[PDB]
Design a protein around this ligand. Structure first.
Ligand SMILES: Nc1ncnc2c1ncn2[C@@H]1O[C@@H]2COP(=O)(O)O[C@H]2[C@H]1O
Ligand SMILES: Nc1ncnc2c1ncn2[C@@H]1O[C@@H]2COP(=O)(O)O[C@H]2[C@H]1O
Ligand SMILES: Nc1ncnc2c1ncn2[C@@H]1O[C@@H]2COP(=O)(O)O[C@H]2[C@H]1O
Ligand SMILES: Nc1ncnc2c1ncn2[C@@H]1O[C@@H]2COP(=O)(O)O[C@H]2[C@H]1O
Lengths: 201, 201
């Protein structure tokens, strides 16, 4: 996508700011538009009738979301604002148009979906083949690649909670605390508050 | 996609017939082309160093596969022929071209990726929230929607093995056999050889 394409999209949308934790998309709702993250981050969640939530992933500035109902549908997952979000909502009708005039816009959307299919297919493998300790270790490493990951002399540090890790791997916060106690005893990470340093990464 | 688009794709490719069980794509290989299923079915697999394989899904006639390395990469998963396959291989270079001339071709690819993201996200939820009995029941129902699913007076019948179900849900064939014994005792299905009837569906 080129700056000229962004310009157009931003010229044909409804802007919206979302405060952290606010729900942008409700699973089940009818799809009618798609979004583009101008600034900030969002969380993709799925959950069982039980209330247990699972974080499928995070999307950041420059990403599109709410695009799965385009080609056809009802919202396939929950999209919640991780941090304050400047978001641009664009109708499916207006999007298919801007895309016919400029194919690179669709190509970029296709690129993002492709990236997500890979990520999600790896998540399937994680849930299928790895134990919790394994998954937690994998999640923390992945989290060190997020844009909110901070740099550190001894590696990388991140702001994260046990609950968030549990949502990502699929286990209680209690078990996460246990895995961390072990990882720390092994000196693989060092936890301190909502902050955590992961050495050598 | 329109018949005219298919015509073009088939005019700019390398045809190949694959016999059932043959590997069409090897995970890890460098991506250079994408495929279009003219006739038949393929299986998407992932696996751990252990040799345990997991069936991520099945694609049928009219589907594209090997498309994740397009927008950018190395093959993200294994693609194996479920049954005899007439396949059309098209280079990424030639595909991006046919797509610029005709955007509907890319739109159809985008539609398929979207469908797969949903399917796979549901698989994540399955592996995250459901027990084996639950997943097996869900898999059998999904299998009743495949094009090879046969019709039946009392419902639907399918050709399937315990090993295949295990690959799909993520458990040994032994456990699958156990779940089936229970499902059958409950008269929810009736197994007979490699054939299995699922009542009321
Ligand atoms: N596995 C996934 N990875 C990344 N984003 C996803 C995943 N599953 C769903 N999403 C999305 O969250 C949105 C929910 O609304 P849609 O179904 O219309 O479109 C969806 C995507 O943008
Ligand atoms: N299989 C699971 N078992 C336990 N918690 C889970 C599972 N899948 C997701 N979770 C969750 O992720 C959260 C971690 O924090 P909690 O333990 O307070 O609550 C948890 C749920 O919402
Ligand atoms: N979750 C999935 N669902 C359906 N097809 C998939 C999934 N993950 C991978 N595939 C694919 O199998 C192919 C492996 O090669 P590619 O990575 O280039 O492109 C891939 C897709 O066509
Ligand atoms: N977590 C798992 N546990 C046991 N088998 C698994 C798992 N994930 C996949 N499988 C598999 O699916 C197959 C079912 O047949 P097998 O039991 O002979 O061999 C199995 C593996 O290849």
């Amino acid at each position: 996508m080129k700056l000229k394409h962004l310009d157009k999209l931003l010229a044909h949308c409804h802007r919206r700011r979302y405060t952290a934790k606010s729900t942008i998309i409700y699973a089940g709702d009818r799809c009618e538009t798609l979004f583009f993250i101008i600034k900030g981050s969002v969380t993709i969640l799925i959950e069982d009738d039980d209330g247990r939530e699972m974080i499928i992933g995070y999307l950041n500035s420059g990403d599109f979301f709410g695009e799965l109902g385009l080609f056809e549908q009802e919202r396939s997952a929950w999209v919640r604002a991780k941090v304050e979000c400047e978001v641009a909502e664009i109708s499916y009708a207006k999007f298919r148009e801007l895309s016919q005039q400029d194919s690179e816009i669709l190509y970029t959307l296709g690129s993002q979906m492709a990236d997500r299919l890979r990520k999600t297919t790896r998540k399937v493998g994680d849930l299928a083949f790895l134990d919790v300790t394994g998954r937690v270790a994998r999640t923390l490493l992945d989290l060190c690649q997020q844009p909110d990951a901070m740099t550190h002399p001894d590696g990388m540090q991140i702001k994260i909670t046990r609950q968030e890790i549990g949502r990502i791997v699929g286990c209680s916060r209690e078990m996460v605390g246990r895995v961390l106690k072990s990882l720390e005893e092994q000196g693989l990470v060092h936890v301190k508050g909502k902050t955590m340093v992961v050495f050598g990464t």
